[PDB]
Amino acid sequence: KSRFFSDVAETSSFVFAVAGADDEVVLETIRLALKQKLGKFLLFGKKEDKTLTANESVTWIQTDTAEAAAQGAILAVKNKEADILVKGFIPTATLMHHVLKKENGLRTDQLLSQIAIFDIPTYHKPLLITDCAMNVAPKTKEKIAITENALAVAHQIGITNPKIALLSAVEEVTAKMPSTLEAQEVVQHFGNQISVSGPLALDVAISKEAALHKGITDSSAGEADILIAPNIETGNALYKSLVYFAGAKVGSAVVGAKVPIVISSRNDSPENKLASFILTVRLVE
Amino acid sequence: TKSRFFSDVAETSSFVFAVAGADDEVVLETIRLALKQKLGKFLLFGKKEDKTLTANESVTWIQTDTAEAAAQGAILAVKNKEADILVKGFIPTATLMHHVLKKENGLRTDQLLSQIAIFDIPTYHKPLLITDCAMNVAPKTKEKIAITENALAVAHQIGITNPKIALLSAVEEVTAKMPSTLEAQEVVQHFGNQISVSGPLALDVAISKEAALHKGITDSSAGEADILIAPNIETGNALYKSLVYFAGAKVGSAVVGAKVPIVISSRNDSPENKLASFILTVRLVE
Secondary structure, rough: OOOOOOOOOOOOOOOOEEEEOOOOOHHHHHHHHHOOOEEEEEEEOOOOOOHOOOOOEEEEOOOHHHHHHHHHHHHHOOOOOEEEEEEEOOOHHHHHHOOOOOOOHOOOOOOEEEEEEEEOOOOOOHHHHHHEOOOOOOHHHHHHHHHHHHHHHHHHHOOOOOEEEEEEEOOOOOOOOHHHHHHHHHHHOOOOOOOOEEEHHHHHHHHHHHHHHOOOOOOOOOOOOOEEOOOOHHHHHHHHHHHOOOEEEEEEEOOOOOOOOOOOOOOHHHHHHHHHHHHHHHHOO | OOOOOOOOOOOOOOOOOEEEEOEEEEHHHHHHHHHOOOEEEEEEOOOOOOOHHHOOOOEEEEEEOOHHHHHHHHHHHHHHOOOOOOEEOOOOOOHHHHOOOHHHOOOOOOOOOOOEEEEEEOOOOOEEEEOOOOOOOOOHHHHHHHHHHHHHHHHHOOOOOOEEEEOOOOOOOOOOOOOOHHHHHHHHHHHOOOOOOOEOOHHHHHHHHHHHHHHHOOOOOOOOEEEEEEOHHHHHHHHHHHHOOOOOOOOEEEEOOOOEEEEOHHHOOOOOHHHHHHHHHHHOOO
């Protein structure tokens, strides 16, 4: 069993810029990160936690509003003072409008997408799933971009020759299920350059024996490294089914910009939120 | 104290399954297991008789030389009230469903047919029904109401008196940026106040009380779903497969909405889950 989040503790001198460093839902992860020297922090927030900031690896910047906290963190990224951007205790939209303004140095021509990496007890290696939380109803062009982002992440974190599976509910291509047509078009686009399969139901992507019993013997069968979800509801449900029912550990980040961005859910566990920080450190290095 | 749908002591009955296309071990293996625990009786419409099956008093073999003849034979058995459950065997699904779906043939009403699965998940505290994971591809409001109606019927029939139903999506608020959320709201508004239906809800809030509270959802139904209504077939199917392959769930599934329950198992489900589907259909006749 190969695991992404292993017993070898991650540590770095990369700087996280935290937009809205307030509330324990935000600070709890920063505290855990500091225990293992995971990185350094620029905390833009309204009410300084003096015990937290008494750390050489922490700098506090007083910001009175959500907008000010977002602007501060974004300019730290623009100025190359920060390596990773973290959304704190502010609305996502407040941070995102700054992220998408090209002058701030984060956005390129590339689509942004969410991606997550899972250590699932009952799977034999790490599994990347995208997009579980950002792109709502991607069609062919967007799914191509989502796959490009996943390929880039795969190389950055050391997964060589990743096997990619475009998920659907069936393998037969039919106009009656347009996600199958889109899947086929993504395969047609990459087909000749990398290992991409689909449309595949989940069983075929992650169980070699399930694939055999469907008459599929492709060497990629049951060995997916990356699943590309057909729509956000599927990605989100798959993500959460792994966390709540399969006991998976998971880190997630928004990718496609010049720096990784962390946007955690309100109810993510401390452990999974730390996993997200660890993923982003591995995406910079 | 966890509750499980699939009982420790094998389910038993004298109900009759009509099997359309009783050929090939992928089909026959489930029948062998059912006979082993005396789950029911069988009318086997097929091409090549297996004497190991037919030597059983609970089995009757009917020779049918084509897939069409097998489908029509099994259907007539149901229509004539000789069979309580219809099972698609070694024939194309479309071959059976073409006949099933013609009001003319007497197996359906105006009600939409849907697939539903019931899961015993080790890390969940009670049975969980999910629909539709395999039949309805892109149901909109009207179809989702029908799918929810079918799910309520199943829940009541199996002893869940006030099932908590969650219209599943990726967020908890209605937004025109995600149509499944608008449809969710419409489905909820359709049902009477005596029905415990809520949505849109993401999976975490549907099945984890702690996750719901952390998101400031203090509803009594949050975290305690008995039924999830999938927003589209890809979400339903992926959830079904995730539970089976990653969470070790036992699952039985059936097509409901017609005058009798229908078994349509995939070519790659395990013998144990295929047997679970027979067991569910016996509970839906009872």
